């Protein structure tokens, strides 16, 4: 199960994340069920917006809102729902919802995995547009659905990123 | 695993559908294996025919025949392979194939997944050419392929479907 | 060439729309050069979004900015960009954008093209959603382009559009 | 202009056939408007099947009808819309439809395209199944249209579908 | 869970493979993990190519890596990565890489899967294009990655193919 | 016609592309044939590459093979075949194929198109292993191909890219 999956081979700088939700897809908001690993549709968003990364969790984790950390993933390609993403955090994105406090952080692929992120070291070292298309789209996804919304708080860099991943570590044990 | 799954949050109004086959999807007929949760390809079916809505099945139900409950579920978009969709029957295709009775059920996703299905509460309040697709899809799927065969019965209402599912929810038990 | 296509069948009730962008499609917005027929990139969007409907023109009108008028098409399936539809409108969205007023018709298939939207007279007939997805796209699609902004004014019916139709075919003589 | 393209460089073994439709494409009827070269929607067909090879004419072709040859072509991977193949009949699908006498080629790619068809010289060498989801294909495809029909023949070989070419180019002539 | 798959229902002709890799996808390398089941990203490659057939592994055998045995399945489309399909081995193509001897059968699918490899006995009845295709992919995919390297032998036919099904299967107990 | 465009608004640093084959692509090598403006389908490409950008050309322009300039447009997303692109050059390949020389320029959107593209002044800025994967392509993607092979040179900077342009608009005046 994907509870056997470690938060990380050596977090903060080598994790893992499961990607619930591919980059560039069709609008449905995938979430795993934790009690059966099934992948089910939460819904099926009401904006005409696509997630510009992909979308998941760290496995063995715990965030403020009781579930896994939320993380986006910058690819060549998007994954399919449900594969694993060996990555290295570059930022975090700070928001509250309609739920609560929801930072999510963003991240890039391994060196193993591929070369083309190796002098991305920190989220200002992506496109300035995509990290503007990811801000924007977290403002207004929920546009359409009453009783959603989000609030922007606005983004940390990579020392901050990592340490959220350390807190969410150590919150599940 | 899948089997973690109930039949509903609130059958038989709120039911649990697992997909295998995606609306709109390539000519592979996939098809879950009980005793490993692994899609399996059972064949690449022999018609240029795609299903026309996603095909799947209720987890811990139990038919007559020995399987748990078919259902197809209309959705706004395909949904993944696999992924698991909380929806609301709204009527019942009785059909007899080369396998022995074969019914199945037709549903919408529930309000909290999308707010489009509102107002349908019968198969009839559907598209008439998407009931139509339907039975053409079920009466032609087969052609090309030997000893495979359909006969088309007729539709029952939502209150008929509702009490399918009760009663395969009982003898799961 | 695209110019021998009139204007309609029998406008303002029975109109060709060439459409230059695809409902659904990536964040592409392609525009056909007058002079040469052909399909110019005129920029890749900067937010992560798409056109919720099929995206053209009526060809042989003129419309307040110079070029022919602006028309939304909804169709069962996004159809190709540079294709040619027979529709017929049922609604007007009144804006204003960096460039001066920017009306948009919002249009179905004719009969003879699909049975779907024979009981679709206005635009309030189409889902609320998707009328609201429209108005959301347009408010917000250019948010990540300096200089680029939509005002929205409102909605008017189809004797309205209709009556926009033939202002733009008599401007065009 | 499409008109600038001759029925081949060898007719009837080397000819050239514009594509409407692709294999396996969306259920958007295409039609190629010979007064504007462009692409129209004809019709979204009403059953979930599709074209199962590419499907489109000869340029400066005439049948006894008054439209070009139509001709399906079989290829590796489905090709654009709108684009040109050079390729050679191998067989000839005698059928009546609502319209009248409906007779289409079958077709292989040139030589100088792809080395797959060097064995295939008649449509009998062509996959069973396939040959089988072509008749399949039409006589079924308008079945959920009122008043489209179609009543198939049968096949004919390579030399009478070469004869059929040359009589379409004499009588554009 | 996925061993629960036997290596067949009667190994070595008829024998299932789990997929890994479909065919002509995008140049995502997924393995899956033997500790979770997990579909993992265990690469984005380097060269613009793409697998020629459906890539993944018999459940429940051993091959000299240590790993389960691995086999190109030849299919009619393209099947889900994580999908399981019943098929039986033509071949053996003989290579080394950077990691040592490096085997990988070819199969097509089982006859109750699709009738068109009826004829198919040796990997030498699939078309030459095809078996030049899968030889200068595995020469090829790896020459933008450093330290990543193939060595092609050749090919060995049906009866070895299925000798090294038995021999990974014993292996594996 | 495509004729009317020009090479450029202000060449060599604003300059039109016509794509014939857009990045990602199936194998499917289109060439617009300059009597009818019309895709023709060159080949089916031998290998299981695919063009890691788009391809096409600059209208209006001659090189020494004798036809439009060659080049490669890097974008955000793959445009549509036959659509025109507003770009700027960045570097050249030098090449020579079975047919003779064989240079091809590499280009990036013009900033009215994206933003994404205002730091790229040389072929040096892009991805390094997008370049390259564009030389490792042309250097293999005929090797299935009698008769067709490819020799390369190497790169060369923006300065000489932008001079081929000019060279090439001055060879067709
Ligand atoms: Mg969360
Ligand atoms: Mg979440
Ligand atoms: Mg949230
Ligand atoms: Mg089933
Ligand atoms: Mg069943
Ligand atoms: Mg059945
Ligand atoms: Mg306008
Ligand atoms: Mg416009
Ligand atoms: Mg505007
Ligand atoms: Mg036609
Ligand atoms: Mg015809
Ligand atoms: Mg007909
Ligand atoms: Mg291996
Ligand atoms: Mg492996
Ligand atoms: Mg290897
Ligand atoms: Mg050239
Ligand atoms: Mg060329
Ligand atoms: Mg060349």
Known sequence: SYNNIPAGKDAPNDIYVIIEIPANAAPIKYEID???????????????????????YVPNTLSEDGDPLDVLVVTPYPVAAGSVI?????????????????????????????????????????????????????????????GRWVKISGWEGADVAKAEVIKAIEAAK
């Open 34 to 56: 934790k009690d059966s690993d099934a992948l089910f549709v939460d819904r099926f968003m009401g904006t005409a917006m696509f997630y510009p990364a992909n979308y998941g």
């Open 86 to 146: 060996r990555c290295r955090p570059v930022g975090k994105l700070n928001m509250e919802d309609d739920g609560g406090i929801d930072a999510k952080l963003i991240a890039v692929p391994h060196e193993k995995l591929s070369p083309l992120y190796k002098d991305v070291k920190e989220y200002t070292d992506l496109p300035q547009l995509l990290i503007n298309q990811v801000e924007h789209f977290f403002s207004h996804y929920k546009d359409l659905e009453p």
